[PDB]
Design a protein around this ligand. Structure first.
Ligand code: NAP
Ligand code: NAP
Ligand code: NAP
Ligand code: NAP
Ligand code: HBI
Ligand code: HBI
Ligand code: HBI
Ligand code: HBI
Lengths: 266, 256, 257, 268
């Protein structure tokens, strides 16, 4: 009676906090990672030490490109394999959290760089979530009704601030917009299977501080509530609540966790 | 520390469920009511039997009119609701603006048209404003060292008002005003760490469009809505403010 | 010759809207509250360009009773619309532009001043528009189908920035929120009468340093930059548009602190 | 004489947009993918009305490389914009209208790789990725123009969809791509504001609704629209696009305007 959660980009920061929060609620967790192998395996060791066989790790580039094997492996296949990993190891997959995401500039103003940025930003933020949801849904539909879990839930990590675009981040902002569209469309189409699909949108959380202290403090001070970025738990606790049975009438909605930052203007 | 919650229109349906859910979390609750005196007092007896001195009831018409004592204004009646919490328990940590009148005000086929305006706008928008203002003043007037650590205001909005119910214009306008109050108060009260959010039901505890709700094809139970209210008031939701959460089973995703 | 009723038409945006509609051929009823001299000067100018193409009517749109029994806001609103029918026999366009705008701080930081602020802010920005729309619609419904105009349009002047609240302006921000709700509800309910209802939301316009924060041009807009949008929405080319609010803010709502 | 580049201009809304801009005095570059005959007929008509006021250019805006090394989508987009500069020496307006639209069901019931792989590249490419590369090329051309030679009314219009927030069942990728296009509208509006290039969206509800279905079914669909109980004509949408490109709309940017007759106001 142990539910299973698949969390993408689970090695650190918010994803790790989400994986820890779901684990604390009793979930067995599949921790996906791309380049953070060491951090992911350390997290798994910790959770497995607290509760045997309660965590595994799986690696996958969620960029929208074909990888090397036979023939080239497509993104859809790599996504189907992540979900399959949960069924193979534990025989179920109740929760999917699309958290993995690349984030960097793609200025409109002044080849392989543009080609890869597009595939990477859109892949991790939108296309992989789409294939992952599709595979997740196919698994549930293919499960005899009597054997289906009673609390399926998909959480897409969106962004509370994309409607007030960050200058120079167009592809990323576009991908997050696509991800909001996926949240609504999948919520409507998967409703018959009682699979809920919602979004959680952070404002500033564990803000990257690779800049002069005054600039990092200036940025944080703009959040109306508390004048700081949020901790990882302040975001993950909301993800955990939406996956809980008490949130079962909630679907197709995006919940901002931004301390009022989207309420500000220049 | 035993926190206090003020819930308007708490006698039955969603408000009753919200008052019960907050009480289950440990809150002492002030149950406001307008005409449902018997149910409000029965609810209070039940909660007080579970935990002595954990509930009181207070009556008030939240319509935007003057009542008989000079005439008493809506603002004064609202300030007295919040004062009731401070007088009895010395604090007021949570305010849930749930009370609300709801009935048609067709644009196509002046005593009832004016009481309708005062009633629909008062309960749904103006009283919430005065209640929030009084709640905030009491917190500002409390020495920092003596302030609670988890202030939260929840405005009960409506997930479907952007797809207007035919013939309910004033009500739809009032809920729109209540969304604006949610955002403006969240911004202005952020310095006092008072969070302000909204919860918007779709169809709940219906007493025919039921089958059009995408998820489960039914209206929600009262708890399916109140559990969300309770979560937003919890410390786990402390970075959330100025936001409205739909609890509608995907109903706002539909089209004719 | 179509007729337009424009509230708060004496100056700034309302004046520009009245001028823009007049330039398209509309006869205009200029409503004013305290700006009698500016309203009458505007009317003289328009009537000099085209005889009997403008009139002025006074009314406090605050949600209170006035002395002549007491006159209610609904009655004063119905009389504004009736003024158009009495003088010209029609009312094709209604522009709810009149609006009070001032602080109503939640935090302290005389006592009836709240009573009047509430009635004034909510009345001009939300309640009067409601009564005006209701009266406008009843007159169209009461007109035999064969004699109805072919291009009914109501424009509500909303605010592009209210979702990023101005600190201390709660009642005003709430009232504009109610006005957006009226725009959608009325659009839906009046669609059968082919009465379109939309909103135009300025960001910063004709300001009496914030300006420099607007992405496009780094300045507030001119009155015409807003009114030309109102005029377009009332034109027959915009006839499939209803229930929608159009921001005219130079990208200001796209900014963050 | 200003110049407008309209993608998917051979028929329906794109044709109407090209005709509307042409009637205002614009020279128009009509892009097409498979509708060569329609596109050339439209160009002949416009050129007969005003010599050298239209050209046609072909391009698959799907997000795939084409045969010439392989040609990338970005290059094909840059060449569309370049065609306007090469022929007329300018490009003032860009209307991203081209768009593929068909089902991509999450469930089968609730060869193969080819239809998925191509659907994703096609739906996302036409509706979101090509618009991005076209906007980027359009902007680079303006930035590279000495201030003294720049046009005075640059405007980009992205054709979005008023109903995507009430998703059409089974059209997830398309719905996602339109969401991305709304994000592009806001992000580019903000970033290009310094060059006075405005970027807005126009979102139809139901327009010139395809009627390949029983008449009672087609009538039932259009009857749901609150205003007039019908889908819109092509002009009812294109006149809005033309207004947004006009100098009277010069303070408008970053916004999406619904042209849906109130359809998004309905609920099931
Ligand atoms: N932090 C904020 O302020 C903030 C604000 C708004 C929205 N969000 C959203 O909240 C979520 C979590 O935020 P975060 O700051 O914790 O994220 P993050 O640290 O930037 O990245 C999360 C993980 O995503 C993975 N990832 C990136 N590209 C990938 C790819 N192409 N294929 C597979 N995996 C990839 C990385 O895994 P490896 O390390 O294993 O390679 C990374 O650890 C994201 O969706 C983000 O957009 C965060
Ligand atoms: N139920 C739904 O499907 C639904 C859908 C969308 C939004 N909502 C919102 O959720 C909240 C709760 O909904 P509900 O169905 O439980 O509400 P409800 O039963 O319609 O009414 C709640 C209480 O509001 C009080 N009230 C009404 N007018 C008042 C006035 N003028 N002054 C003082 N109190 C007044 C009444 O108290 P007395 O009985 O004591 O007089 C009533 O019991 C409301 O804000 C509602 O708008 C509900
Ligand atoms: N200007 C901006 O930056 C801006 C920004 C966002 C939204 N808007 C909106 O655009 C519209 C026009 O803006 P604006 O700056 O031109 O407005 P404004 O100058 O502030 O006022 C317009 C007119 O409203 C009338 N008015 C105010 N209270 C009234 C009342 N209680 N009863 C009757 N009339 C009343 C006044 O008429 P009298 O002078 O005759 O008394 C005033 O001339 C308004 O709805 C406003 O909210 C403007
Ligand atoms: N019609 C409606 O009710 C409606 C509703 C909401 C939104 N919209 C939006 O309004 C715009 C115009 O609508 P519409 O009905 O006129 O569109 P449409 O007829 O479905 O298609 C427009 C053109 O897009 C081109 N196109 C499709 N895929 C392409 C690709 N991969 N590469 C290059 N070109 C491609 C086609 O050109 P060729 O014929 O030359 O191949 C087609 O003629 C679209 O963005 C649409 O999404 C329309
Ligand atoms: C720095 C920026 O203002 C904001 O904190 C965001 N950070 C991130 C993001 N997305 C990811 N994947 N990682 C981040 O650190 N979206 C927005
Ligand atoms: C019936 C309607 O469709 C919907 O369930 C609503 N009900 C109610 C409401 N508001 C109140 N106060 N009471 C209701 O029963 N808002 C919307
Ligand atoms: C000053 C403020 O930031 C903004 O320009 C607004 N001005 C006004 C407004 N409303 C009115 N009636 N008058 C104004 O001058 N709404 C917002
Ligand atoms: C048929 C549907 O309800 C609606 O009219 C749409 N049609 C179209 C669309 N997009 C394109 N490209 N073509 C269409 O015909 N988006 C939505």
């Amino acid at each position: 009676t142990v539910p299973v959660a698949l969390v993408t980009g689970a090695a650190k920061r918010l994803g790790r906090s989400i994986a820890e929060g779901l684990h604390a609620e009793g979930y067995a967790v599949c921790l996906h990672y791309h380049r953070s192998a060491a951090e992911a395996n350390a997290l798994s060791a910790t959770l497995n030490a607290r509760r045997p066989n309660s965590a595994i790790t799986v690696q996958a580039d969620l960029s929208n490109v074909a990888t090397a094997p036979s023939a080239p492996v497509t993104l859809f296949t790599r996504c189907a394999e992540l979900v399959a990993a949960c069924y193979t190891h534990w025989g179920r997959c109740d929760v999917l959290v699309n958290n993995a995401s690349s984030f960097y500039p793609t200025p409109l103003l002044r080849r392989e760089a543009m080609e890869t940025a597009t595939a990477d930003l859109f892949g991790s933020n939108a296309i992989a979530p789409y294939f992952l949801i599709k595979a997740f849904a196919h698994r549930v539909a293919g499960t005899p009704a009597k054997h289906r879990g009673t609390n399926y839930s998909i959480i897409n990590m969106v962004d509370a601030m994309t409607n007030q675009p960050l200058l120079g981040y167009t592809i990323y902002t576009m991908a997050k917009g696509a991800l909001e569209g996926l949240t609504r469309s999948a919520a409507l189409e998967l409703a018959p299977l009682q699979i809920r699909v919602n979004g959680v949108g952070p404002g500033l959380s564990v803000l990257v501080d690779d800049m002069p202290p005054a600039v990092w403090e200036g940025h944080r001070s703009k959040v109306p509530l508390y004048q700081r970025d949020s901790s990882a738990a302040e975001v993950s606790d909301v993800v955990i609540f939406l996956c809980s049975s008490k949130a079962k009438y909630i679907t197709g909605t995006c919940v901002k966790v931004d301390g009022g930052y989207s309420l500000t203007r220049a």
